[PDB]
Each structure stands twice: as C-alpha cells, then as structure tokens.
Amino acid sequence: AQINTPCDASHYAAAVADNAVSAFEQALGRAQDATVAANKLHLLASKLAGAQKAATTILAAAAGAAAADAIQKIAAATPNFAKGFAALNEIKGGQIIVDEMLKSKIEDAATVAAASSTSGATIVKIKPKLQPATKRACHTLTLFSLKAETPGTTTDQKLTLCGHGSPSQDPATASCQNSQANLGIKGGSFIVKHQMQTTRTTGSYSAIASEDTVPNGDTITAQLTEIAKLENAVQALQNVHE
Amino acid sequence: AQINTPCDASHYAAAVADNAVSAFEQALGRAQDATVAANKLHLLASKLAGAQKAATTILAAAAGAAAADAIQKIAAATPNFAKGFAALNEIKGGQIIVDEMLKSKIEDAATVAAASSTSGATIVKIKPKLQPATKRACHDETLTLFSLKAETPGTTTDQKLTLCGHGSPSQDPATASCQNSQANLGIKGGSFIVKHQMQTTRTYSAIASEDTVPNGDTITAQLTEIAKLENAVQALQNVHE
C-alpha cells in the first residue's frame, strides 16, 4: 500500500478491479466445466451398460445439479458486482482527475511600473496555468482530494502582491520587498494534495469525514459503500466450487 | 443527447452502463434457463419408457448443448465487456470532478492603502476558492464530453483577473469598479477555469489532443475501450436458446 500520489491510488483501484474480473471469469469457467462434464457424462452413459451405466448417470446428474447451482449463484452475484465495479472505476477516474489537477498553478507576473500597472496592456493580470500530462495521464486504502492552497502572509510568500524597487523583476528568482514603486504577482500552486484514509471485514468500508475539498467526503463515502458491495459479491463468487 | 453540463455526461454514461448490465443479466438468465431445462428434462426422461423417453432425452441433450454454448459465449465476451465497462465508469467518474471543479474561482480582494499592501497582514493575497457541492456531488441533496480550460485574464481596467486600482480604501470589487489609480490596491478575480466542449464519432474517432485537463490522449484511450464495451454488448445480445 505504497500510495503516495493519486495516480498510485488509481492504479490500486485498477488492481482491485483486475482481481474482481478474474474471480468472475473463474466462476464462469467453473460453470462451463460443470455443464460440459454433464453433457459428456450423459452421452457416455447412454452407450455404457449395467451398474456402471447407473453410476455414470448418477455422476452426470450430480454434474448437472452443480452446473445449475453455479449459474444460479453467479446470476445472483452479478448485480452488486456490477454496482461496486462501477463505483470503483468512478473512484479511479476521479483520482486521475485530481492527480492531473494538482499541477495547476497561478503564474507569477513580472513587475511593472506602478503608473503602468492598473491600466493598459501592462496591467498586472492574474494568470491561471493548467499543466496537462505530457501524454497519457496517470501512466487501509488511501485516496486523495483537492484543497485550496492558503495564500502567504508576508512579502516574499506565495500568492501575494510582490513589490520591487525596479521593474521587470521576476518573483520566481528575485525576492519581494516592501516597495510600491513596482508591482508584480508572486504566484503559487492553486491546489494542494489532501490525503484521505479508509481502513477496511467483519461477518463495511470505513467512513471518510466530509470536508471542503473536491471530491467532498460525502461522494467518496457514497462510492466506498458500493465498493463494499463489490467485495461482498466477490466473496460470494469465489465460494462456488467445481 | 441533451448533454449541456459535464455532470450530465456522467448520467449519460451511467445510462449506457445500465443498458450494458441489462444485456449481461439477460444473457446470464438465458443460460440459466437452458441449464435448468436440460437438468429437469433429463430427470423426467429417466422416469419415462419407450420412444417417449428417447424423444425427451434428445430434447434434453439439446437443452444441454445450447446451455454449454451460452456460457461459452458469455465468458468469451466477459474480458472485453469489463475493459470497456471500467473505462466507461472511469469517464463518468472523471466528469463528476470536472463539473464540481467548474465552480472554482479566484476571490476578490478589498482595496487597501498602497503603503500597507506589499507587506504584513494587510497584503493583497490571491485567495483560491473551492465550492464543493453541499451534499453528494451531482446527486442533488458523436459524443459530448467536457474538459477544463484555463481562464484568460482581461486586458484593461475593470476586467477579470486583474489588479484593481481605486482612490478609496475598503472597496469590494464585486460592487465597486476599478479605476487607473495606484493609491489603493485590490484584486478583481473570477473563475479559475472554463468549460471546454469535446466530441467523438460513433464510427471512435480520436479527439484532437488538448491543452486541457482531462488530456486528449487520456479521454481518447478511454474512448478506445468503450468500443470494446459495445462489441461485447452486441455479442451478449447475439446469444439465445
């Protein structure tokens, strides 16, 4: 559970989805094997003779009962399995978006003369910056959320009105000073990464406290309650035996 | 399609997922019917005599064979059904965030005297503002997708995402208008991100790569698997007794 970034949590959800689909396919394969065994055992028993023909028909009837019971259990487990699978992939996509959103920032503005800062093309604009991944994004459970960064409380601090005694100075390198002769903007990250934990199996998937972040805790909780249905359906699917 | 907001595309994809699960459950139920029919038909044919027995077992064997076929089809579609289902519910789960992040905005800063605007507690801070849904998000209390573009600041005075000058202190940009005066300083903020429409084609054409989040390559790779979802849905719709 080395979940340090939201992409790691999305890949962990991908691994859980892989194990769930593998369990479903194993149950379907056991049902197919029981049905094939029932058909072939019947067809072989038809050409046998005597008490061995009787024993072969008993085995064929047991195989057909096993096939019917397995298909019944799989059809019973299908709905909650699909529900939790859908909610799990929703959490995975939401973690993809929150991971690619963490690299957003407010670009720093170069200092300009104070007379040419509240008007004209030289206005000290606040410029958003989005940073999409270079190609393919994202390429005791832990999840993540987007929090608003708190702005700084002094001169040389993030998301503040930078001041300089000379114009054309970059906040990213030169430090800010208590001056109104030239005005600029010291930016910073627009969103910070908030951790969330949801420790899990009596017989239930924790409860993440609701916050003021995106996603809010109510949404993550509503998705976790369906993921619990998925894991219960997986425990039901594995319990079939052939 | 009637998709106008990013939150609506999630409900469209959810309806598509419900139709896919409906097709899956119908195929599994048809296999269940064939299996129970073969089982009970064999048990009845054992209780008969004469050609009426042979007439029944033949039919029972048919109910066996088709049953063995049905699972063989269903499992054969199960891989491709999942890879497209997951990505579908990925896209929906992404669209819930985009919509919920569309309300993000940079707050306005009340004007303050220039002498106390570049230092101390009285600095003009650029304060981020998130607006999460009061309860569950998106839950009250050719495709049409959406993505998050960057906002563009204005070019003059009294424009969005600019330094607001004013001749008097304690003025709020939401009510006061900015003026070319350096005596008092504040911030005229606005939305941090804008909506950006996205589209595909039913026959899935790779959407042009973006400068936005979600990236064009990511939504493209997910739309590639949604086609496998529809293929497995058709294969599940072509199995019957």
Residue numbers in the entry:
A (entry chain A): 33 to 171, 192 to 252, 254 to 256, 260 to 298
B (entry chain B): 33 to 173, 192 to 253, 261 to 298
Original paper wording:
The structures of VSG21 and VSG545 were also determined, both harboring closely related folds and biochemical properties that distinguish them from other VSGs. Of note is the fact that both structures were obtained with proteolytic removal of the bottom lobe (contained in the C-terminal region of the NTD sequence). This cleavage occurred spontaneously during crystallization experiments performed with full-length VSG21 and the NTD of VSG545 that had been produced by limited proteolysis with Endoproteinase Lys-C (LysC). Presumably these cleavage events in the crystallization experiments occurred from residual contaminating endogenous protease(s) from T. brucei (and/or possibly residual LysC for VSG545). In contrast, for VSG21 and VSG545, the cleavage in the crystallization drops produced a truncated NTD missing the bottom lobe sequence but maintaining the 3-helix bundle and top lobe of the protein. Finally, it should be noted that for VSG545, crystals were only obtained with PNGase treated material, removing the N-linked glycan. VSG21 and VSG545 are more similar to each other than these other VSGs, however, distinguished from them by the tightly twisted nature of the top lobe and, directly beneath it, the presence of a second three-stranded beta-sheet perpendicular to the axis of the 3-helix bundle. VSG21 and VSG545 align well to each other in the top lobe but not to the other VSGs with beta-sheet top lobes. Superpositions with predicted models from AlphaFold (which were accurate enough to solve the experimental structures by molecular replacement) show possible conformations of the full NTD for each protein.
Long-term immune evasion by the African trypanosome is achieved through repetitive cycles of surface protein replacement with antigenically distinct versions of the dense Variant Surface Glycoprotein (VSG) coat. The mature VSG proteins are attached to the cell surface by a GPI-anchor, and consist of two main regions: (1) a large, N-terminal domain (NTD) of roughly 300–400 amino acids that is most distal to the membrane and (2) a smaller, membrane-proximal C-terminal domain (CTD) spanning 80–120 amino acids beneath the NTD that harbors the GPI-anchor. Therefore, at the heart of antigenic variation in the African trypanosome are the NTDs of the VSGs. These large subdomains are elongated folds centered on a three-helix bundle scaffold.
